[PDB]
Design an enzyme around this catalytic site. Structure first.
Site, PDB file in Angstrom:
ATOM      1  N   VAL A 188      -1.891  -2.137  -3.982  1.00 22.76           N
ATOM      2  CA  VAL A 188      -1.653  -2.986  -5.141  1.00 22.76           C
ATOM      3  C   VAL A 188      -1.796  -4.442  -4.728  1.00 22.76           C
ATOM      4  O   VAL A 188      -1.346  -4.842  -3.649  1.00 22.76           O
ATOM      5  CB  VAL A 188      -0.263  -2.722  -5.756  1.00 22.76           C
ATOM      6  CG1 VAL A 188      -0.033  -3.593  -6.979  1.00 22.76           C
ATOM      7  CG2 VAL A 188      -0.111  -1.249  -6.107  1.00 22.76           C
ATOM      8  N   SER A 218       0.831  -1.198   0.000  1.00 26.36           N
ATOM      9  CA  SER A 218       0.000   0.000   0.000  1.00 26.36           C
ATOM     10  C   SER A 218       0.868   1.252   0.000  1.00 26.36           C
ATOM     11  O   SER A 218       1.518   1.560   0.998  1.00 26.36           O
ATOM     12  CB  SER A 218      -0.942   0.014   1.207  1.00 26.36           C
ATOM     13  OG  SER A 218      -1.944  -0.979   1.081  1.00 26.36           O
ATOM     14  N   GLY A 224      -2.421   4.403  -3.950  1.00 25.63           N
ATOM     15  CA  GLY A 224      -3.336   3.290  -3.784  1.00 25.63           C
ATOM     16  C   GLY A 224      -2.619   2.070  -3.247  1.00 25.63           C
ATOM     17  O   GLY A 224      -1.424   2.102  -2.933  1.00 25.63           O
ATOM     18  N   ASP A 257       6.440   5.329 -13.785  1.00 28.39           N
ATOM     19  CA  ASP A 257       6.364   6.548 -12.988  1.00 28.39           C
ATOM     20  C   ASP A 257       6.076   6.223 -11.525  1.00 28.39           C
ATOM     21  O   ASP A 257       5.424   6.997 -10.820  1.00 28.39           O
ATOM     22  CB  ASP A 257       5.328   7.525 -13.557  1.00 28.39           C
ATOM     23  CG  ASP A 257       3.914   6.979 -13.515  1.00 28.39           C
ATOM     24  OD1 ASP A 257       3.744   5.745 -13.444  1.00 28.39           O
ATOM     25  OD2 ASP A 257       2.965   7.793 -13.569  1.00 28.39           O
TER      26      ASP A 257
END
Ligand code: GXH
Ligand code: BOG
Ligand code: BOG
Ligand code: BOG
Length: 336
Positions: free
Chosen positions: A33, A28, A31, A163
């Site tokens: 994942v 975390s 967000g 990114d």
């Protein structure tokens, strides 16, 4: 249209199409994942559930920015979007956004492990970075924070520019960025590539600064204090007077810094690690450099479709950013 199922993961209820199986937490900010298996494609995927995507104007615009960017990136050496979905059936009940891409297991740090790589291996890695950068730069995008943790490499050694970092610094930043210069050239990313390439060749960080001032000190010891032509382009009276008060450091001979390296690698580093951003080689020019002779294909280094970034100037309401985001989810077309 798809059938969704609910599962508590990362301390919230995830709701995903049934194609995505065996969700397991990965970690975390933006967000949390999970890894999953996409039964429809046979791919291991990463699913990101954005956190508080429309809590504020800032959040909502950030969510739109991220979705627009991921939807536009369609290149072998750039992270791309496999899927985006929401459990919502309409704009009125739209609150959650899920992003799906390939599951990545390693970044460039994991591949290097503080070792010198073979010259052929360096050529292949840097070639792929520059190939992706040519694409990104052709969309009038600047990465601005390129570094090994933002470069994933799969088992085939295909590299993708991210990114973000994977689940578990300023050493690769261009000097003008660390001086808050603004008016950034796309060659700020080329500086970062030079730092990465140097590290791949030597097995050592090129500029391992301890803090901001140390970082600049180390840079100037390699590339020299600003020359006369660069000093002409410095409008800041405060920057000018401080720079000239420093004792002149000559630019070092890179041939005597990267001892034993491919002379072509040295030549390319000399063209990437130039203090003046206007004199740095571009990504397209770098791809044509003799160092990449065995990988360069001028007909397979594509550029991006035009990328409309006019939304960055706009000040809209939350429900407007949310509606534009919903439009982008509805219009998404999976890649082939
Ligand atoms: C199950 O096998 C594994 C075993 C071990 C293991 O290590 C713990 C991993 C982790 C490998 C990994 O992290 N893989 C990965 C990540 C992403 C990310 S990471 C991110 N934010 N950063 C962030 C977020 C949370 C925590 C830390 C960093 N976002 C996306 C992302 C971006 C766009 C998407 F559409 C989907 C996901 C994308 C693809 N692979 C796996
Ligand atoms: C058993 C582990 C999960 C297996 C895959 C679930 C795949 C869902 O896949 C989808 O199911 C829909 C309903 O049949 C079909 O309409 C779609 O065509 C199919 O792609
Ligand atoms: C998905 C495409 C990756 C390659 C292009 C990166 C383009 C610049 O993406 C960067 O992403 C960062 C994420 O935190 C943002 O904070 C920066 O403002 C932004 O410029
Ligand atoms: C001691 C001063 C150290 C850093 C000098 C950095 C010079 C970077 O180069 C400068 O970058 C600017 C922003 O993109 C451009 O506008 C200038 O034309 C370019 O010369």
């Amino acid at each position: 249209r798809p059938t969704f199922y609910r599962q508590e993961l990362n301390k919230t209820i995830w709701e995903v199409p049934e194609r995505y199986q065996n969700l397991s937490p990965v970690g975390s900010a933006y967000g949390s994942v999970c890894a999953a298996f996409d039964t429809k494609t046979g791919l291991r995927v990463a699913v990101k559930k954005l956190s508080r995507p429309f809590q504020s104007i800032i959040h909502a615009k950030r969510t739109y920015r991220e979705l627009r960017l991921l939807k536009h990136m369609k290149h072998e050496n750039v992270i791309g979007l496999l899927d985006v979905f929401t459990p919502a059936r309409s704009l009125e009940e739209f609150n959650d956004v899920y992003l799906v891409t390939h599951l990545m297991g390693a970044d460039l740090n994991n591949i290097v492990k503080c070792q010198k790589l073979t010259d052929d291996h360096v050529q292949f890695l840097i070639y792929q970075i520059l190939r992706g950068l040519k694409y990104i730069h052709s969309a009038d995008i600047i990465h601005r924070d390129l570094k090994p943790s933002n470069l994933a490499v799969n088992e085939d050694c295909e590299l993708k520019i991210l990114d973000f970092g994977l689940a578990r610094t300023r050493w690769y930043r261009a000097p003008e960025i660390m001086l808050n210069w603004m008016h950034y050239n796309q060659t700020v990313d080329i500086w970062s590539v030079g730092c990465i390439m140097a590290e791949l060749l030597t097995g050592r960080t090129l500029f391992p600064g301890t803090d901001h001032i140390d970082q600049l000190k180390l840079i100037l010891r390699l590339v020299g204090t600003p020359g006369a032509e660069l000093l002409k382009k410095i409008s800041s009276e405060s920057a000018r007077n401080y720079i000239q008060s420093l004792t002149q450091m000559p630019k070092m001979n890179f041939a005597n810094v990267f001892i034993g390296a491919n002379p072509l690698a040295v030549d390319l580093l000399e063209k990437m690690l130039v203090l003046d951003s206007d004199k740095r080689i571009t990504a397209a020019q770098a791809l044509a450099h003799a160092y990449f002779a065995q990988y360069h294909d001028p007909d397979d280094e594509p550029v991006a479709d035009p990328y409309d970034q006019s939304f960055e100037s706009r000040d809209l309401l939350i429900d407007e950013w949310k509606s534009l985001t919903y439009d982008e989810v509805i219009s998404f077309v999976p890649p082939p």
